[PDB]
Design a binder for this molecule. Structure first.
Ligand code: CL
Ligand code: CL
Length: 537
């Protein structure tokens, strides 16, 4: 196994689709585990087969209690940086205090948690931080100063002290699935950049932990190391590195499926890599790339089954089977897909304009997924083409099957008209649903301003925080295009306000992987940039 030039990475990935992974050394033959197996230390290890060797063991200061030296953690090098990380086992009740003493004695500023607390009812790691307020863990008082919950990870700011108090930031990756590795490595690369951002140049080693302290924790350390190697050597050698880190902590990467995943992340980071940009700071090429996002046509069964054919305005813009909106019972089908927002999963329902023969279903979707906000981006007719069925009453009330819609208020503001309805189901019988009907999109082309588009996003956000905080029903006609533009800018703008960063490309690309042809035309993509420019001023 020799190094792969990045020039040939994509090809070698194809060719290798297990044997490589099985040739790695299990770090056990050049190692010594005397200290880890001491009787005194038995109860301190979560898994008795996954133990630090004596040489790279993190060694705590001796606290007159015997065998107080020990913790299940080991130093791990980065690409050209001795001891960049500490790969630690996720602490348990009995070692929570010893854990913080490590963070303190090692001068660490960052903890990377790659596990959830419980997994399918099995406790994979004990909570070692206060929910609210403060807690003294031994001679170290930890205090929560902030918690920010984004969709793929959450971020916690601690203030630890026993003279100078110190700020430790915990980055907790929530998205990692129970069984197997993730799906895209998109989330993990963004997460890994946020760690680079929040760790100070002067700080101690980064504490990375999962359950056993080898596996996720390993795939994470390797992906960082190998990004470094690309950015320096223009070549990647995953095999020689995993081999190296195992002689510091054995078993570092745990699965065949994990080893492959390092490569996928590395490829993603090469092919698409730098498309993020800071709000401080051509599109043609980026759009070509977006357009080469494969459509998972295998994974589109339900939407193509014969009965469901007739229910779609465009038999080509149709939900993937995994993130499709499913209703109470082929009556389970509505051309509509769940889409991740910036702060939570399944935050938007991106749907088509109801057909005259799918209003019943439409309103069942709204009712069954507790939607209270509808964003409409077309008019009923456009250029003499019937682009959406009017599903809402204008004057009185209308009953679409079991649901009843009665219109309470209807205010035509600048660009957006804003209707209010009492949706009933013929004491949890009645809701108030609010429709934002955007008249600011031209019958042909994109709008040339985007003040009115900023003002709609903004309007829908207040409505969300008030009628808090359910999934938003966005539709136009085809159910991807404008819906896409809107969902994209919603997420892009939230993050600009929040992180002061801007990655339109990945934003849209992430939309393409949830529903086909989401942002659709280069016009609409250009527009995204244009609205962000307008927002910045
Ligand atoms: Cl949890
Ligand atoms: Cl694991």
């Amino acid at each position: 196994y020799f190094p792969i030039p990045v020039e040939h990475l994509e090809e070698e990935i194809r060719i290798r689709s297990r044997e490589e992974f099985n040739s790695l050394p299990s770090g056990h033959i050049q190692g010594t585990f005397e200290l880890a197996n001491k009787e005194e230390n038995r109860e301190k290890n979560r898994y008795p087969n996954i133990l630090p060797n004596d040489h790279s063991r993190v060694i705590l200061s001796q606290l007159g209690i015997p065998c107080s030296d020990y913790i299940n953690a080991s130093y791990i090098d980065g690409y050209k940086e001795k001891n960049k990380f500490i790969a630690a086992q996720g602490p348990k009740q009995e070692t929570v205090n010893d854990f913080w003493r490590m963070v303190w004695e090692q001068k660490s500023a960052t903890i990377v948690m790659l596990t959830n607390l419980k997994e399918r009812k099995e406790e994979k790691c004990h909570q070692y931080w206060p929910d609210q307020g403060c807690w003294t863990y031994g001679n170290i008082r930890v205090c929560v100063e902030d918690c920010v919950v984004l969709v793929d990870y959450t971020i916690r700011k601690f203030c630890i002290q026993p003279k100078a108090p110190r700020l430790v930031s915990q980055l907790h990756f929530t998205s990692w699935p129970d069984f197997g590795v993730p799906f895209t490595p998109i989330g993990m690369l963004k997460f890994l950049k946020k760690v680079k951002t929040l760790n100070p140049v002067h700080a101690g080693p980064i504490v990375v932990h999962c359950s056993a302290g080898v596996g996720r924790t390993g795939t994470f350390i390797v992906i960082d190391a190998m990004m470094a190697m690309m950015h320096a050597e223009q070549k990647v050698d995953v095999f020689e590195f995993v081999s190296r880190i195992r002689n510091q902590r054995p078993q570092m990467v745990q699965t065949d499926m994990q080893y492959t995943f390092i490569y996928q992340a590395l490829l993603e980071y090469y092919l698409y890599g730098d498309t993020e940009l800071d709000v401080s700071s051509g599109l043609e090429e980026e759009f070509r790339k977006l357009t080469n996002v494969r459509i998972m046509k295998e994974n589109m069964r339900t939407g193509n089954l014969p009965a469901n054919m007739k229910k779609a305005r465009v038999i080509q813009i149709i939900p993937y089977d995994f993130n499709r909106v499913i209703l109470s019972m082929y009556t389970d089908y509505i051309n509509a897909s769940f889409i991740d927002g910036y702060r939570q999963k399944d935050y938007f329902i991106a749907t088509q304009g109801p057909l005259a023969h799918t209003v019943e279903d439409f309103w069942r979707m709204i009712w069954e997924w507790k939607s209270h906000t509808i964003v409409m981006l077309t008019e009923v007719q456009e250029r003499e083409q019937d682009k959406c069925y009017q599903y809402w009453p204008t004057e009185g009330s209308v009953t679409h099957g079991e649901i009843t819609i009665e219109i309470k208020n209807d205010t035509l503001s600048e660009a957006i008209s804003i209707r209010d309805f009492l949706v009933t189901l013929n004491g949890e019988q009645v809701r108030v649903v609010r429709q934002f009907h955007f008249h600011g999109w031209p019958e042909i082309g994109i709008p040339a301003e985007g003040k009115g588009m900023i003002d709609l996003i903004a309007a829908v956000q207040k409505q969300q925080q008030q009628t808090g905080n359910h999934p938003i029903t966005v539709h136009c006609s085809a159910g991807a295009g404008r819906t896409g533009t809107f969902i994209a800018l919603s997420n892009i703008l939230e993050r600009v306000k929040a992180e002061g960063l801007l990655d339109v490309f990945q934003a849209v690309k992430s939309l393409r992987l949830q529903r086909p042809h989401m942002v659709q035309t280069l016009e609409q993509y250009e527009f995204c940039y244009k609205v962000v420019q307008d927002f910045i001023d």
